[PDB]
């Protein structure tokens, strides 16, 4: 499996506004093939970015979502971001261990 | 829940030895009170560090693991480290969405 973390830069005080924008976004990705879940992660220490952590069965499944549904899920919204920059961090899951 | 990512710098070519070390490490953390699982992530693009992504009920559950078990699990291990440095990135889970 793969992990794609989008590391997003957020201005001082904009955390609440950013999280509200994610709060009702589940529908946009929940039913994608090969999608294994995602978390919005609020930084607390050691990092200043929000980490949007997504898990996929394969890189192909991620690309498919990113190129179609993801762009479609923008239809009603403004494209005016609170985020000041972004970096996609991409990994291969080498070991996965549960509780 | 909380997420603690340890971001470890690892010289090119030591990835196999490092991954081999992690392949035999589950015993050291699993069944810890409040531990919810963890992944080793090999970097692919946008990062050169391995991300050790750990999930916990609470920060206190994480600290109790780090202050006892994690230190104890070093007893007897005569290997020299292959990692070059580490930075702890600490997060709060604001949103969790499954498949
Ligand atoms: C240039 C690039 C770019 C810009 C300016 C951008 C901006 C935005 C803004 C602003 C919003 C907030 C809308 C709102 O008011 O709720 C939003 C939401 C969102 N966007 Mn994007 N977005 C991308 C790229 C961009 N998006 C990429 C790339 C992805 C993923 C592959 C993505 C995924 C989303 C999803 C998913 C939402 C949430 C949709 C929803 O709630 O319906 N997009
Ligand atoms: C991992 C893959 C991933 C990529 C490359 C991606 C990329 C982007 C880019 C680029 C931006 C614009 C940032 C800026 O600095 O202007 C953006 C915005 C956004 N994205 Mn996302 N995005 C996701 C995943 C991704 N997003 C997922 C999963 C969701 C949740 C359903 C989501 C939801 C959003 C929302 C909401 C915005 C608007 C953020 C803002 O207003 O700052 N997304
Ligand atoms: C600071 C310095 C520091 C050094 C030099 C270090 C070095 C090592 C080396 C070398 C190994 C395994 C080698 C072998 O014999 O196969 C190892 C394993 C391990 N270490 Mn550490 N380690 C930490 C800190 C350190 N560790 C911290 C901090 C944590 C967590 C809070 C941690 C957790 C572990 C765990 C868990 C293992 C795996 C134990 C096992 O599989 O037996 N640690
Ligand atoms: C999250 C929290 C977390 C912290 C702060 C942590 C910290 C460290 C530090 C510091 C080092 C030494 C790096 C160096 O530069 O020499 C190290 C090494 C190590 N750690 Mn970990 N570590 C884990 C979690 C953590 N580790 C977990 C979970 C495991 C596996 C059960 C693990 C396993 C290792 C192994 C294996 C090593 C030895 C790496 C090597 O071979 O160089 N760990
Ligand atoms: Cl994002
Ligand atoms: Cl580590």
What overall form of chain A do the CA principal axes indicate? Answer: globular
The assigned CATH architecture of chain A is: 2-Layer Sandwich
Total helices of chain A: the number is 3
What is the CA–CA distance across the termini of chain A?
Answer: 19 Å
Q: What is the multimeric organization of the chains shown?
A: homodimer
Per CATH, the class of chain A reads Alpha Beta
Specify the biggest β-sheet of chain A: 4 strands, antiparallel
Radius of gyration of chain A, in Å, reads 14 Å
Q: State the secondary-structure class of chain A.
A: alpha+beta
Helical proportion of chain A, percent range: 10-25%
Please indicate the count of domains of chain A.
1
> What's the count of strands of chain A?
4
PDB class: oxidoreductase
Keywords: Oxidoreductase Activity, Metal Ion Binding, Heme Catabolic Process
Assembly: dimeric
Entry title: Crystal structure of MhuD R26S mutant with two Manganese protoporphyrin IX bound per active site
What does this structure look like?
With 99 residues, chain A is α+β, with helices and mostly antiparallel strands. Chain A has a single domain (1-99), classed as Alpha-Beta Plaits. In chain A, 22% of the residues lie in helices and 40% in strands. Chain A has helices at residues 15-23, 59-67, 69-72, and strands spanning 2-9, 35-45, 50-56, 85-98. Chain A has a four-stranded antiparallel beta sheet. In chain A, strand 2 (35-45) and strand 3 (50-56) form a beta hairpin. At the A-B interface, strand 1, helix 1, strand 2 and strand 4 of A face strand 1, helix 1, strand 2 and strand 4 of B. Bound molecules: manganese protoporphyrin IX (4 copies) and chloride ion (2 copies). The site of one manganese protoporphyrin IX has 12 residues of chain B, from loops.
